[PDB]
Structure formats: C-alpha cells, structure tokens
C-alpha cells in the first residue's frame, strides 16, 4: 500500500526470522 | 522506533513459545530417562 | 543501526531461551 | 503487529507438527 | 505490479519461510 | 487481514505435508526397529 | 494464540506416545532378563 | 495464495528428494 | 527497474530459498 | 492414527522375535548342558 | 498438490529400500551367528 | 507405574527360576555324592 | 519452575529403581552363593 | 518511507541474517 | 535510492544467502 | 502464473542436483560400509 | 543490550542445572558401584 | 511359560543320565571288588 | 529465470565445497 | 516375512552344529574313558 | 543399609551349612574308622 | 558504504554474543566433563 | 558487489566465532 | 565439591564391605581346614 | 537406478568378506583345538 | 546479467572461505584422530 | 550448469579420499589383529 | 581467556579424581589379594 | 578480506586448544593404563 | 557349507590323535606291568 | 581390491603365528612329559 | 592439496603408534608368559 | 608413586602370611611325624 | 611430540611394575616349594 | 617382523627354564631314590 506499510511489515518479518534462526542455532547440541 | 515495538511484541510471543516447549520437554525427558534408568538398573540387578 | 540492533537482540534472545532447554536435557542425560 | 503475530504462529505450528514425529521416533527407538 | 501486490506476496512468502524454519527447529533431536 | 488469510492457507497445506511425513515415518521406523530387534534377539539367543 | 490448538494436540499426542514406549520397554526388558537368568541358573545348577 | 502454494510445493519437493537419500543411507547403515 | 521486475525476481528467489530449506529439513536424520 | 499403527506393528514384531528366540535358547542350552552332564557322569561312573 | 508426484515417487522408492535392508541384514546376521556358534560348539565338544 | 509392575514381575520370575535350579542341584549332587560314597564304602567294607 | 519439577520426578524415579534393584540383587546373589556353598561342603563332608 | 530508507534497512537485515546462518553453519560438528 | 539499486542489491543478497544455506545443507553428516 | 513458471524451472534444476547427490552418495556409502564390514568380519574371524 | 536480561536469566538457570546434575550423578554412581562391589566381595568371600 | 518347560526337560535329561551312570558304576565296582575278593580268598585258602 | 538459475547454482556450489570437507572427515574418522 | 525365514534358518544351522558336536564328544570321551579303564583294569587283574 | 542385611543373611546361611557338614562328616568318619579298628582288632586277637 | 557501517556495527554486536556464549560454554563443559571423568574413574577404581 | 562482499564477510565472521567454541568443546570431550 | 564427598563415601562403603567379606572368609576357611585336619588326624592316630 | 547399484556393490562386498572370514576362522580354530587335544591326549597316554 | 556478476563475485569469495576451512579442518582432524589412535593403541598394548 | 565444474571437482576429490581411507584401514586393522593373535597364540602355546 | 580457565578447571578436576581413584584401587586390591593369599597358605600349612 | 582478522584469531586459538587436548589426554591415559597394569600384575604375581 | 567341512576335518584330526595316544599308552602300560610282574615272579620263585 | 589383499595378508600372518606356536608347544610338552615319565619310571624300576 | 597433507600426517602418526605399541606388547607379554612358565616348571621339578 | 607403595605393602603382607604358614606347618608336620615314629619304635621294641 | 613422551613413560611404568611383580612371585613361590619339599623330605627320611 | 623376534625370544626363555627344571628334578629324584635304596638294602642285609 504505502512505503511506510512495506517498511513496518519488513521489520516485523525480520525480527521473527532472526528469532527462528536463534532457536535453530541454540538447539545445536 | 518501529523495530523496538516489533522486538517488544516478539518478547511476549517468545515467553508463550518457551512455556509450551518447557511443558513438553519436562514430560518427554521424564519418560526417556526413566526407561533408560529402568533398563540400566534391571541389567545391574542382573 | 536501529533495525540491526533489534534484529540482533532477537537472535540472542532466541539462542538464550532454547539454550536453557539444550543444557538441561544434556546435563540430565549424561547425569544418568 | 499483525504480520509478526501470524508469522510467529506459523513458526510454532511448524515446530508442533514436526516435534510429534521427533518425540515418537526417539521414544520408540530408546524403548527397544 | 502494485504496492499492494508486493505487500500481499511478501506476507505469503514470510509465513511459508517461518513454517520451513519451524520444521528445521522441530526436527533437532 | 492478509496475514490471517496466508496463515489459514498454510494450515491446510501443513496438514497435507504432516500427513505425507507420517505415512513415510511409520513404514521407515517399522523397518529400522525390526532389523534392530532382529539383530538383538538373535544375538541374545546366542 | 492461533497455534494454541497445535500445542494442545501435541500435548494429547505426547502422553499417548509415553504409554506406548513404557509398554514396549517392559516386554523387551522382560524377555532379555528372562533369557539371561535362565542361562545363568542352568549353568550354576550344573 | 498462488505464491504460497508454489513456495510450499517447492519446500515439499526439496524434503521428498533429500529424504530418499537420508532413508537409503540410514537403512543400509543399520542393516550392516 | 519496474515493479513487475522486482515482483518476478522476488518470487524466483522465494522458491529457491524454500527448496534449500527443504533440503536442510530433509537431511535431518 | 498412523502412530497407533506403527506401535501395533512393532509390538507384533517384538512378540514374534521373543517366541523364536526362546525356542533357539532352549535347543542351544540343552546341547551345552547335555554335553557337560554327559562328560561329568561318564567320568564318575568309569 | 504440485509435489504429490514427488511424494508418490518417495513412497515407491522407500518400499524398495526396506527390501534391500532386510536382505543384507539376513546375510550379515547369518554369517555372524554361524561363526560364533561354530567356535562355541567346537570348544564345548573338546 | 509400569516400572513397579515390571520390577515385581522380574523378581517373581527370578524366584521361580531359583526354585527350578535348586531342584536340579539336589538331583545332580545326590547322584554325585551317592556314587562316590558307594565306591568308597564298598572298598572299605569288602 | 518446570525444571525443578523435572529434576524432582527423575530423582523419585531413580530412588524407586535403586530400592527394587537392591532387593533383586540380594535374592539372586543368595541363590548363587547358596548353591556354591552347598556343593562345596557336601563334597568335604562326604 | 523513502527508497533510501528501505535500502539501508534491507542491508542491515541482510548482514544480521548472514551472521545467524554463519553461527548455525559453524555449530555443525 | 533507485529501483535498479534495490534490484541489484536484492540479487547480491539472494546469492550470498543461497551459498550460506548450501554450506549448512552440505555440513549435515 | 509467475510462481508456476518459477516452480517448473526449479523442478528441472532439482533433478540435476538430486542426480549429482545420488552419484556421490552411492560411491561414499559403498566405501564407508565396506570399511565397516571389513573391520567387523576381520575381528569376527578373530 | 536489549537481550542482556535473557543472558542473565540463562546464567542463573545454568548454575541451578549443574547442581541438579551432580546430585543425580552421585546417587546413580553410588548404587551402581555398591551393587558391583557387593557381588565381587561375596564371590571372593566364597 | 517357555522357561518352565525347558527347566523340566533339562531335569528329565539329567535324571536319564544318572540312571545310566548308576548302571555303569555298579558293573565297574562289581568287577574290581570281585577280582580283589577272589585274589584275597585264594591266598588265604592256600 | 536468470536469478533462479544463478541462485540455484550458488546453492549447488556451496553444497559441493562443504561436502568435500564432510566426506574427508567422515571417511578418515571411520577409517581409524 | 524375511525375519521368520532367517530365524528358522539360524535354528536349523544350530541343530546341525549340535549333531556334529555330539559326534566329536563321543569320539573324545570314548578314547578318554577307554584309556583310563585300560590302565586301571590291567593293574587290577595283573 | 541393604548390603549390611544381605551380608549378615549370607553369613548366617553359611554357618547353617557348616553345622550340617560337621554332623555328616562325624557320621562318615565314625563309620570308616569303626570298620578299620574292627578289622585290625579281630586280626590281632586271632 | 552503508554495508560497511552495518558490518562494523555487527562486529561490535558479535563480540558481545561470543562473550556471552564463552561464559556459558566454559561452566557447562566444566560440569559435563567432570561428571564424565567422575563416572569413568570411579568405575576404573572398580 | 559491496553488499555481497560485506554480507559474505558477515557469514565468515559468524563461522569463525562459533567454530572456536565447536573445536574447543570437541577436542576437550574426546581428550577425556 | 560433590565429587570429593561422593568419592569418600564410595571408599568408606568399600571398607565396610571388606570387613563383612573377611568375617565370612574366616568362617568358611575355619570349617574347611577343621574338617580336613579332623579326618587326617583321626586316621593318623587311630 | 543409482540405489540398486549401491545395494548390489555392498551385497557383493559382504559376500566376499563372509567367504574370506570363514576360511580364516577354520584355520585359527583348527590350531586352537589341535593344541588343546594334543596336550590332553599326551598326558593321558604318558 | 546482474545475477551472473553476483555469482562470479561469489565464486571468488567462496574459494577464500573454503581455503580457510581446509587449513583449519586439516590441523583439527590431525589432532582428534591422533588422540583417538593414541588411546586405542595404548589400550591394545594393554 | 554454472556449478557443474564444482561437482566434477568433488567427484575427482571423492575417489582420492576413498583410496586414502582404504590405505589407513588396512594398516590399523593389520596391527590390531596381529597384536590380538600374538597374545592369543602365546597363551595357548603355554 | 575463558578457554584457559576451562582447561585449568578440568585439569584440576582430573588430578583430584586420579588421586582419589588410586587410593580406592589400593584398598580394594589389597583385600582381594589378602583373601586369595590367606586361603592359599592356610591350605598348604594345614 | 574484512573477516581475515577473525580467521587469523581462530588459527592462533586452534593451535592453543590442540596443546590443551594433548596435555589432558596424556594424564588421563597414563592413570587409566597404570591402574589396569597394577591390577593385572598383582593377580599374575599371586 | 564351510562349517560342515571344518567340523569333519576337526573330527578327522581328533581320530588321528587318539590313534597315536592308544599306541603310546600300550607301550607305557606294557613297560610298567612288565617290571611289576618280573619283580613279583622272581620274588615268589626265590 | 585393497580388502582382498589385506584379508590374504591377515590369513598368512595367522598361519606363520600357528607355526611359531606349535614349535613352543612341542618344547614345553616334551619337557613336561619327559620329567613326569623320568620320575615315574625311576621309581618303578628302582 | 591440504587433503594429502592431512592423510600423510595421520599415516605417519599411525606408523609411530604401531611401532611403540608392538614394543610394549612384547615386554608385557614376556613378563606374563615368564611368570606362568616359571611357576609351572618349579612345581614339576620340585 | 602410589603404585610403588601399594606393591611394597602387598609384598610385606605376603611375607607376614608366609611367617604364619611356616609356624603352622612345623606344628602339623611335627605332630604327624611324632605319631608315626612312636608307633614304629614301639612295634620294633615289642 | 607429546605422544612419543607419553608412550615412553607408559613403557617405563610397565617395566618397573614387572620388577615389583617378579619380586612378589619369588617370595610366594619360594615359600610354596619350601613347604612342599619340607613335608615331602621329612616323610621320606623319617 | 616384530612378532617373529618376540616368539623366538619367548621360546629361547622357555628352553632356559627347561634347562633349570631338569637340573633341579635330577637332584630331587636322586635324593629320594637314594634314601629308598639305602633303607631297602640295609633292611635286606640285616
């Protein structure tokens, strides 16, 4: 819709991907 | 900061996920180590 | 740098939460 | 926050579906 | 094509990536 | 919500994938544990 | 939580799997110890 | 929903192709 | 260049990432 | 439930193996004990 | 499902691999138990 | 608890095996001592 | 704390197994020692 | 907001994802 | 800055992510 | 559909990659299991 | 550091887990060595 | 109970061996005692 | 299809380079 | 079932080994008892 | 202390066996010595 | 370069993360290897 | 090429930092 | 240190077992030597 | 099919190893049994 | 092609990374297998 | 295929690694079996 | 350097365990050897 | 290379870790072989 | 059947050893009996 | 095939060990039988 | 080629270990055999 | 050197046992020889 | 090389143990042969 | 060939022990036979 809309959505997607990668990295024994 | 708001929302969501994982981890490890201790001590009694 | 700092904080949070499970499971397993 | 909530729900759904396989396989393996 | 087009596509890509990362994280014994 | 619609579509797709995985997992584990139990019990008969 | 239903399903599935494991452990350990004790006692009994 | 359906199909295709290698290797290994 | 250009490129990047995540998930014994 | 089918198949496999194993244990143990008792008594009587 | 063909191929491939495994298990276990029993009986037979 | 039930069963199975073993010991020892005393006392008297 | 609950449950499981194991050890050891001492003294006295 | 805003944010997201993938790759024994 | 700028940057980010996922997939024993 | 075209191109690329992996997997597993079977059977001959 | 609190929590949790492990190790090792020594000494003591 | 049948068959075989050992020992003892008495009586007579 | 072909080539290159390390380490380990 | 066929083959292989073993035992025991009785009876008679 | 009770019970059983062995050895020694003295005295008298 | 600035910020953040990991790794490995060395040396004393 | 060079440098930095932990843990484990 | 406390306890547990073992040895050896000397000296004197 | 080629190569490798192993078993077993029988008979005859 | 240029730059960067990995892999595996071979051969000398 | 060169390099590298593995396996297995047979034969040879 | 601290702590742990283990080895070995020598000489002297 | 410094640090860190490993291996193997040889020689020395 | 040939060869070697043992025992018994009879007859004659 | 060459070498190494072992057996057995017959025949003749 | 360097270093390490191991085997085996032969002959001669 | 002290203590305990064995053997031999000489001398005198 | 130094130390530690062992053997064997010859020669002379 | 040298040294040591055993057995046999002949001749003369 608007540039701000894309910006805010992209930021929220980034933090949730970084958390998932964090879980995968932490679960490596 | 938009990133700050996203991180704060993630913190609340994370506590739900780690609460779920903990409730499963406890029961599963209570079962696997109990069947491991069972097999070990039976064979030790021999 | 704001999105980098908060995205990195998210990664460290995820490692810290899961590592608590990994360490508990590993210690108890080798304990028995 | 909508896309964060639904993207996180997708991650938890994926963990829950696969974890059911992992637990079943591990329990049965150490059972024998 | 349109901003809305990019926005909707990006959201659908995000949920399918988060599910795949979820499978990888859950399959760690 | 566009995210809600995407998640609902993913839920339906997920049930297909987990149904596929389950149908393979069952057969594979039925074979591996059976060859493990076979080798174990033959050696126990000794 | 949109995925609370998935966690609830996993929880009800896990308690079923633990019951399955304990049942199979008891039968395998029972046969293993039984065969081992039989061989030991018959040799001691000359 | 088109990009979701085709992206998900790509994930399932990848799992199916690699899982064939994993199962073959595991079965043959425990077979010997 | 054009919105359509970005849209098509993003879709092709998405399928190739999902395949790679699929290989990683399938290779977990 | 694919999980129940997997457990049932493995439980049946285990039961078959236990039966076959016990049969072979009896035959092999009988031979070993028979040879030992024969050599012991033949020397006492002679 | 665009990847249903891939699952169908994996299913037909898996049943072939299980047959391969059982064939190799039988030959390896057969030789192992055979050699072990041969050594055991020859020692008992003096 | 499946553990307690299994442990009690393995103890009862051991107890019954001990009963069978002692019966066999008495039979073998009785013949052994009997033959030895027979040869000894016959030589001493005659 | 779910971690404390997991540790407490496993500590209780271990304590139960140790008690049951020690009981079975005493019974099995008693039988083995009893058979050996019986065979030794019966030959010395005879 | 602005194209430059999206560009700078995307670059910062990329380096933090590459570091996380680096940790996962390095933790494979 | 420009659409072409975003396009070129996105392509370079994609190849470096695919290489990292390739290392993770190849390191699975 | 742009996504359909991308998926169809990926299908062709995937067959190349899985063909490469298979040609390496076969040779590698032929070597590792052969050195495993070698070490096992030499030690069994003893 | 926004996630310093998470690290601090993990640090206080880890020292608790190490205490749990050492407690369970001591009890399992104690019973294992005790049973093994009991069997060894009773056999040596005839 | 496969073990019960096996123990009973082993004890039945043991009883069979004793029956044969006692028959042979009577013959051997009779022969040696006969020679001793014959030589003793003839020497005393002459 | 250009970005798909080159992105896929990058994935295959990464697998090939790392797989050489994995195979060498595994073979030498089981060799001893 | 490949399992059943293999188990029956391993039991038949054990049975034939027992037959060969018993033949060897008879030959060795026969010579042992024969030599002992020969030396004993020769001394008793002459 | 389960081990202390077990050791005490084993020593009590051992003392029981000695009591029986000494009773039997007195009877056997008395019988053989009696026959020897009887034959010796009668020979000296005549 | 915007990428240069992002990488330089990441370098500083990385040193924090690797400092956290190191402080946890040291304590955890000090505990696991100590319980491994403990169990090993106790069993070696035997 | 700037974003590729710096993104690749980030990946190598991450591998180097974590690999130091992996090697230390593995060596000490097999050492005992 | 939990390690030191456990090691001292395992050493004390071994020490008490050695005490129990030596008591049993004296009882068994005393009866064995006593019976042997009894039969020997009775024959030598009478 | 690369999978069939892999299975066939491993099946051939296993067959070769089994043949070579059985040959070495016969030679080593023959030497061990030959030495034992030689030492036994040479003492009986002497 | 912009993608072609990116891939060509990645190829050069990849050779640096795989050169780094190889230089570390060689030294690490030279150490781990040497401590594995050391522990194995010392215990074999026994 | 832009990465066909990488696959070709891996293929030529893999066949070299397999040769390296077989060479090291033969030398380690040779020494292991040699030492084991030496100890076995010297004990049998008295 | 956190790595040096980890190595130093583990080196200290190992040194303590070796000292405690050697002490327990001496006590347990002394008892076993003492019982064996006692039983050997008491029979030679008697 | 912006991360060449990180590789150089890892290289200087790796050579330090290898030295740490060899030091700990020598002390653990030394104690293990020493205790094992002590028990072996004392038993052979009677 | 490699085992059948091996068992037959072992029994053939066993029969060979008996042939030699019987030859030697005849010579040894003949010599000792001859000396005994010679001394006895000469003493009776004178 | 490196496997075939290694298997043939291990068989030849076993064959040469058997040759060395038999030489040692003859020397030891010759002295043992010689000393025994020397003491026996000397007593019989003188 | 870093791979060749790694193989060469490990091949050299293995060769050194085999040489050192064989030397220690000879010394330890010589002592064990020497003690056994000494105790055997000293009893035959005495 | 913990081993040196342990070996010295074991040898000191061994020397203690010999001191006691020699004392007892003198008493037993003196008693039996005394009875033999007494009976012999009295018979010769009368 | 830490390996070479450790291997030389383990060989020297074995050598010193052999020295201690031989000293103990001489003491035990000397008493054993001495007591046996004492009882034998006393009976032969008186 | 390290094994060849070791076997030769063991056989050389064995031959040394025989040389000493034969020397001692000549002395012991000479002494006992001398006492027997002396007593026999003196009794016949008187």
């Amino acid at each position: 819709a608007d540039f701000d809309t894309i910006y805010q959505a992209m930021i929220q997607i980034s933090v949730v991907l970084c958390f998932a990668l964090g879980i995968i990295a932490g679960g490596q024994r | 900061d938009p990133a700050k708001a996203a991180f704060n929302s993630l913190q609340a969501s994370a506590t739900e996920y780690i609460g779920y994982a903990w409730a499963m981890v406890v029961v599963i490890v209570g079962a696997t180590i109990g069947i491991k201790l069972f097999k070990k001590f039976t064979s030790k009694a021999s | 740098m704001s999105v980098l700092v908060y995205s990195f904080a998210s990664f460290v949070l995820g490692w810290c939460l899961r590592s608590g499970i990994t360490y508990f499971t590993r210690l108890m397993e080798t304990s028995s």
Side-chain angles (χ1 to χ4, degrees), chain A, chain B, chain C:
Chain A
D2 187 33
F3 297 82
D4 194 28
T5 304
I6 310 296
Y7 180 64
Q8 291 168 351
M10 186 178 55
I11 288 194
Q12 297 181 15
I13 289 155
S14 172
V15 290
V16 79
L17 288 178
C18 289
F19 178 83
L21 296 178
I23 298 299
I24 302 175
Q28 290 175 327
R29 310 216 302 178
Chain B
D1 301 351
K4 179 200 304 293
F7 176 67
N8 296 345
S9 302
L10 185 130
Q11 281 180 311
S13 302
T15 65
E16 305 168 345
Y17 169 71
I18 205 52
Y20 288 162
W22 252 122
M24 212 50 66
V25 164
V26 47
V27 200
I28 298 301
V29 303
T32 187
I33 305 182
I35 72 189
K36 173 211 300 294
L37 285 173
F38 179 76
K39 293 184 303 174
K40 164 197 171 59
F41 279 110
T42 54
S43 301
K44 288 301 176 178
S46 182
Chain C
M1 196 190 53
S2 178
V3 69
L4 185 136
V5 166
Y6 282 107
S7 292
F8 202 97
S10 175
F11 164 75
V12 176
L13 177 68
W15 173 85
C16 289
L17 288 187
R18 183 61 197 268
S19 286
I21 300 283
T22 305
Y23 297 142
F24 176 81
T25 302
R26 191 159 60 183
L27 281 177
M28 285 301 188
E29 179 183 356
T30 179
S31 176
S32 44

